[PDB]
Design a binder for this molecule. Sequence first.
Ligand SMILES: O=C(O)CCc1nnc(-c2ccccc2)o1
Ligand SMILES: [Zn+2]
Length: 112
Amino acid sequence: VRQVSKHAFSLKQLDNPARIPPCGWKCSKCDMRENLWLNLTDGSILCGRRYFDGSGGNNHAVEHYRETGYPLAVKLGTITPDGADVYSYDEDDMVLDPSLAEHLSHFGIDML
Ligand SMILES: O=C(O)CCc1nnc(-c2ccccc2)o1
Ligand SMILES: [Zn+2]
């Protein structure tokens, strides 16, 4: 089961966020249009890790986490009225963000 992230309740979200569109995103560091993560602190849009089997992205989201320490990201294309896929770099797991609606509203995302 996905547990509540310890970061969720008091997550920092930076002022002057981008309006994140409902489709058509790309990694800001490469050509990936699949497997994109929206960082819930800064609204960066970056691709997922390269898996050891050769699958996945080009590690741009994790590289960004190593620089910023911003732990929570939502997988774009998984946001629905029932929730979303939220990952914590810090806890290294998929997690629950009980403030997800609020976190997404920051970026002009109405999950409903
Ligand atoms: O790829 C990224 O940068 C962010 C998403 C991500 N990194 N690792 C995982 C993971 C780890 C444990 C369980 C399930 C998924 O997901
Ligand atoms: Zn990338």
